């Protein structure tokens, strides 16, 4: 009993039902069952499709956009136990986006060993709360019953009831003839026999004889050698939370993919290693990393969006190739780097084609091996076409790279100098590989500025809010070509990193200060700034006069008076003690040297009893009259010795306790 | 009086002794040493009318012009430098106008630049004098670098349309223009509308006077002089008009130089090249046929001269060499060639072309090819950066000229030409809501449906009907009975909300004439 016919694995079927007839003599699914993507199937396609022989699906049952399917009692009129060995989003019944699915027909769904139930976007689905999941599941707290027809209450869900044990004051039923196997309170979850005695402490759902670990129908946690056991000891290993396996189970399944070659950690037979590990393949005890090799399916993958990019998050090595047509997306090169900038190695080729809106590929700093095992056709390990806005491969003085095979398809990418190619020819080390118009020279680097020189500051003056600058007047041969000066400030105290200024009067040069000028006005004090200017010159129809550009400078703001000492709270916890507490100023503007506390009695230049609070955010004020009105003044300071730079007052008051 | 040209000294300036009317231009410049005292002792206020234009350039000392010619009244605008009857340029000391008596620029505009001392602008209107007010470019002045309290010096009715008014405001004679010394009097006009003859304003020449240079009336003897003094333009007589040349298809008479029709006009180019840029270039070869050489064009304007282009334009249909156009931004059509059927391309546009096209952005029409044919003897076609001319007309022009087998890969820029179509898919099913729109719409299928890439639904809100989503292609494989009407659900809609919505189709270009595809109609859908 419990194993009549065939023991089959899982099945995934799409767009036709010539293949679902294979579950006729299949009594067991050792896996899951997903019927998906059938917009052409009809209710006639599932009425003459009935499988009472198929009993247990170990992982889950999934349905996904099958038009026409209406009920599972038409398909599988005896679906009872889903052990949940594998779970989709921690669900053992995933009913997702089912059009035409009118009911479950799960009048005999009795047990789930592990998991929950996913019922989403099923616009026709009823019989969901009536087939009560609390009697099936250990944990209904994790269920997903949303966006259904049972949710928006229009289902005419009728029970068969228009000696079952009872817990309103109401019992629960499954069919007209199927009472639930209901066990008493002392039989917690192990199930019980026909007369009602509690089984061993390792059973689940049902057992055949009570108080015996060899007689369960399902096990609670574990099982070994004709007996639901408490744990899996060595030289055996844990496996899949319903049994124990030995070493030769784990060793040989590691060797049959010669794919999740089985490994061992914490006396288990796990498919792959846990975190930070690179196995010893011999003993397979989850060895520590000495790394994420992402073999792509059929050696390739096309990435064109951030959603297509999040799929390979955290990869390092690619045992395959990539295709790239990324033309847009929000938070590009940041979502793209956290997913894919981590990638170090590529076995196959690389393809980029028509990837429009991207400007710099510097964020793939890891990508330093290309094996070129799969080759882009034309004897290339590389493809770049129509990649329009691209202006940086890398700082090749920064980024080194190994490309093992193949040539380089450089075509129609009009915004890159040949020097970056000649960088990449040099630094990746493939300069002698590429044939005739692998590099289409005239289709690249013809629609971007090439300001070959540097803008340099003849004068710099700073303040806390103001930075006055004078720098080099660049002049093209015909000076009419100069159209502007393009100061691109951005705030950066880090040095690991937008204003346009018109051309000045050319007009002369015996002694002509046409050094152009900029003063800033709204700047944060004590604050450093990635600022970089560029000459705006005219692209001639001929060789454009290139221009200059300033370097990314980093100029910190001056240190001025600090901000308000935040939240002055004066608490009179005694007749003589007052605890004054506060927060640091939001603008230190210079390193906060100390704080200043004054205090002053309210009646009922001169010295007040004072306190310089050095690098502390609290103060107890002692030596005070009982129950007397005080006025307390608080200041902060970011300069201490020379003629101090200090904050404004933060007034507060407190009256001590009486006697 | 003819057009005069004075530089480097004030010597030739007192030759203006008695000129009441200029029939010509004026170009006086390069006078830095001249002083404001050098112009106070200087005036020739006899002058009333100029035909062509004026040049003004870097004459120092010069401050105002009401002293010199307070009585200058009309620029006819008969020759326009870059469509300007005036450019005032780099004029130091030049402070004000006082020139109320100028009345009509009949033709042209004024470009004002670098006249760093200029005031007195705002209280005077342009539509009064200039027929076209838009083409003025007024920049780089004292009033521009804002310092001038522009008043009139003093601080005609609309029925006096072109004839203008006298001193009391009465409309002048039909052949007056602008002003009359006595109201409605051709004799006592200040200026003539059409012709001047014998102290009077007439419209035509009474015989034997020829309609000579469109403002006067000279007898046979006078034009007969103009021929023989060149023994320079020896003039000819045709259609009661003494003129310099006979137009195309014409043959002179030995007796009276009548431009008789030929029994079957060679505008032989200087250097075999006219590089073409301007109105000033446009007046030159009006009405030609034979272009004995090649032509280069750069006109990046925007004030589209397209009509007055076509006035002094192509009655040509022949080019002995190639053709060149680069960066001619402004124009949209090329239909304005009245005869054009042949280019030889024997001189090759380099790249062995008959032709050069670059950065010609607004161009949408070559021709109605059914009407206007095309023949190219030698050469290929340089077609580049012309984002409003489709490859269809290109492949037509390949075919109408018949030179489709001559051109090579990216002689025609395959991308930047026409990137800024025949079918229109229709919404075969429409569902709406207060918050949703579900649609099914007609299936487009190219023959090679490997090339099919997507459906591009442009949508935006538009309560006005004064008017961005890709949607996937469905599965072809066959379509006898398939709802390959693809579906997409609008989801984020507000109740009672109006959109402009239209689909467009996305395919892959095969190197043939492009299998086009569809848009959809700009539909307007309101929610609830």
């Amino acid at each position: 009993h419990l194993y009549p016919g065939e023991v089959c694995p899982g099945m995934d079927i799409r767009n036709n039902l010539t293949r679902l007839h294979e579950l006729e003599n299949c009594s067991v699914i050792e896996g899951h069952l997903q019927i998906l993507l059938m917009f052409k199937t009809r209710p006639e396609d599932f009425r003459d499709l009935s499988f009472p022989k198929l009993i247990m699906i170990t992982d889950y049952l999934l349905l996904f956009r099958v038009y026409g399917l209406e009920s599972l009692k038409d398909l599988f009129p005896n679906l009872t136990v889903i052990r949940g060995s594998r779970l989709f989003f921690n669900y053992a019944l995933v009913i997702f986006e089912m059009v035409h699915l009118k009911e479950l027909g799960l009048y005999n769904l009795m047990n789930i060993t592990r998991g929950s139930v996913r019922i989403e976007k099923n616009n026709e689905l009823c019989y969901l709360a009536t087939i009560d999941w609390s009697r099936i599941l250990d944990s209904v707290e994790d269920n997903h019953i949303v966006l259904n027809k049972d949710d928006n209450e229009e289902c005419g869900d009728i029970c068969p009831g228009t000696n079952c044990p009872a817990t309103q004051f109401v019992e629960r039923c499954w069919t007209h003839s199927h009472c639930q196997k209901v066990c008493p309170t002392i039989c917690k979850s192990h199930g019980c026999t026909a007369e009602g005695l509690c089984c061993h402490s390792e059973c689940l759902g049902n057992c055949s004889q009570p108080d015996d670990p060899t007689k369960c129908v399902a096990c609670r946690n574990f099982y070994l050698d004709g007996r639901c056991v408490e744990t899996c000891p060595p030289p055996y290993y844990h496996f899949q939370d319903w049994r124990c396996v030995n070493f030769s189970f784990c060793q040989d399944l590691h060797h049959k993919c010669k794919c999740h070659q089985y490994v061992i950690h914490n006396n288990k037979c796990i498919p792959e290693c846990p975190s930070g590990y690179t196995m010893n393949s011999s003993n397979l005890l989850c060895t520590p990393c000495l790394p994420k090799v992402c073999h792509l399916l059929e050696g390739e993958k096309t990435i064109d969006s951030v959603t297509s990019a999040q799929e390979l998050r955290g990869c390092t090595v690619i045992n395959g190739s990539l295709i790239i047509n990324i033309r847009g997306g929000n938070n590009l090169a940041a979502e793209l780097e956290a997913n894919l900038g981590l990638i170090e190695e590529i076995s196959g080729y690389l393809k980029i084609r028509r990837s429009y809106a991207l400007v710099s590929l510097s964020f793939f700093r890891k990508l330093r091996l290309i094996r070129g095992e799969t080759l882009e056709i034309g004897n290339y390990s590389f493809y770049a076409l129509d990649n329009q806005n691209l202006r940086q491969l890398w700082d090749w003085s920064k980024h080194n790279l190994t490309i093992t095979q193949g040539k380089l398809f450089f075509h129609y990418n009009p915004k890159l100098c040949l020097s970056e190619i000649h960088k990449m020819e040099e630094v990746s080390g493939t300069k002698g590989r590429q044939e005739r118009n692998d590099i289409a020279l005239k289709t690249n680097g013809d629609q971007a500025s090439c300001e070959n020189e540097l803008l340099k500051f003849s004068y710099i003056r700073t303040s806390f809010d103001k930075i006055l600058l004078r720098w080099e007047p660049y002049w093209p041969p015909d000076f009419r070509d100069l159209l502007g000066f393009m100061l691109f400030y951005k705030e950066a105290p880090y040095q690991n990193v937008v204003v346009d200024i018109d051309p000045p009067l050319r007009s002369n040069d015996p002694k002509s200060q046409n050094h152009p000028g900029w003063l800033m006005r709204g700047l944060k004090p004590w604050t450093q700034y990635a600022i970089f200017v560029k000459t705006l010159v005219t692209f001639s129809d001929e060789r454009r006069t290139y221009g200059a550009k300033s370097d990314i400078i980093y100029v910190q703001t001056d240190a001025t008076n600090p901000s308000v000492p935040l939240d002055p709270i004066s608490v009179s916890n005694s007749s003589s003690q007052i605890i004054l507490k506060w927060k640091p100023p939001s603008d230190p503007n210079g390193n906060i040297t100390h704080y200043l506390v004054f205090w002053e009695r309210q009646a009922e230049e001169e010295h007040r009893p004072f306190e310089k609070v050095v690098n502390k955010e609290s103060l107890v004020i002692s030596g005070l009259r009982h129950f007397t009105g005080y006025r307390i003044e608080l200041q902060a300071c970011n300069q201490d010795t020379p003629e101090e730079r200090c904050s404004v007052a933060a007034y507060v008051s407190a009256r001590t306790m009486p006697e | 009086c003819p057009g005069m040209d004075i530089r480097n000294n004030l010597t030739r300036l007192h030759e203006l002794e008695n000129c009441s009317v200029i029939e010509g231009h004026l170009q006086i410049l390069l006078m830095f040493k001249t002083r404001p005292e050098d112009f106070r002792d200087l005036s020739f206020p006899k002058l009333i009318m100029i035909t062509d234009y004026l040049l003004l350039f870097r004459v120092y000392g010069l401050e105002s012009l009401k002293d010199l010619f307070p009585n200058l009244t009309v620029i006819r605008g008969s020759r326009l430098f870059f469509n300007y009857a005036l450019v005032i340029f780099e004029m130091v000391h030049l402070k004000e106008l006082g020139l109320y008596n100028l009345m009509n620029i009949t033709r042209g505009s004024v470009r004002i630049e670098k006249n760093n001392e200029l005031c007195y602008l705002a209280t005077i209107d342009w539509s009064r004098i200039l027929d076209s007010v838009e083409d003025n470019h007024i920049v780089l002045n004292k009033d521009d670098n804002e310092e001038c309290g522009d008043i009139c010096p003093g601080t005609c009715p609309t029925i006096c349309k072109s004839h203008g008014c006298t001193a009391e405001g009465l409309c002048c004679h039909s052949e007056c223009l602008g002003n009359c010394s006595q109201p409605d009097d051709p004799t006592k006009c200040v200026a003539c509308r059409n012709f001047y003859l014998d102290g009077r304003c007439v419209e035509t020449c009474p015989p034997p006077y020829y309609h000579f240079q469109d403002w006067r009336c000279v007898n046979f003897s006078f034009c007969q002089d103009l021929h023989h003094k060149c023994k320079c333009h020896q003039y000819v007589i045709h259609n009661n008009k003494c003129i310099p040349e006979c137009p195309s298809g014409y043959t002179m008479n030995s007796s009276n130089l009548l431009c008789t029709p030929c029994l079957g006009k060679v505008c032989h180019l200087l250097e075999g090249e006219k590089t073409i840029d301007s109105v000033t270039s446009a007046q030159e070869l009006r009405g030609c046929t034979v272009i004995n050489g090649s032509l280069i064009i750069n006109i990046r304007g925007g004030n589209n001269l397209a009509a007055e282009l076509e006035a002094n334009l192509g009655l040509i249909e022949e080019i002995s060499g190639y053709l060149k156009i680069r960066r001619s931004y402004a124009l949209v059509s090329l239909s304005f060639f009245r005869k054009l059927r042949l280019i030889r391309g024997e001189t090759l546009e380099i790249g062995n072309y008959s032709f050069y096209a670059l950065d010609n952005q607004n161009l949408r029409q070559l021709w109605d090819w059914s009407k206007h044919n095309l023949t190219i003897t030698q050469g290929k076609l340089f077609f580049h950066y012309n984002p409003k001319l489709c490859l269809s007309e290109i492949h037509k022009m390949e075919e109408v000229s018949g030179t489709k087998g001559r051109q090579e890969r990216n002689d025609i820029a395959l991308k930047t030409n026409g990137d800024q179509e025949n079918e229109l898919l229709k919404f075969s099913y429409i569902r709406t809501s207060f918050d949703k729109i579900l649609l099914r719409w007609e299936p487009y299928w190219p023959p090679d449906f490997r090339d099919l890439l997507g459906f591009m639904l442009f949508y935006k809100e538009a309560p006005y009907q004064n008017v961005v989503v890709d949607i996937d292609p469905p599965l072809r494989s066959n379509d006898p009975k398939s709802q390959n009407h693809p579906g997409w659900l609008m989801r984020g809609l507000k109740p009672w909300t109006q959109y402009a919505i239209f689909v467009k189709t996305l395919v892959t270009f095969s190197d043939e004439r492009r299998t086009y595809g569809a848009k959809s109609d700009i539909i307007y859908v309101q929610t609830d």
Binding site: - | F81, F82, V87, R111, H137, N298, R300, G301, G302
Partner: peptide, 30 residues
């Protein structure tokens, strides 16, 4: 908004050249 400023600034610059071109030419006849 870019290329509208690209044209005229060069086109006004273009304007100024041919009027310079009819300056230098009559200096030699020789």
């Amino acid at each position: 908004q870019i290329l509208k400023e690209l044209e005229e600034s060069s086109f006004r610059k273009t304007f100024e050249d041919y009027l310079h071109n009819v300056v230098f030419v009559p200096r030699p006849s020789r």
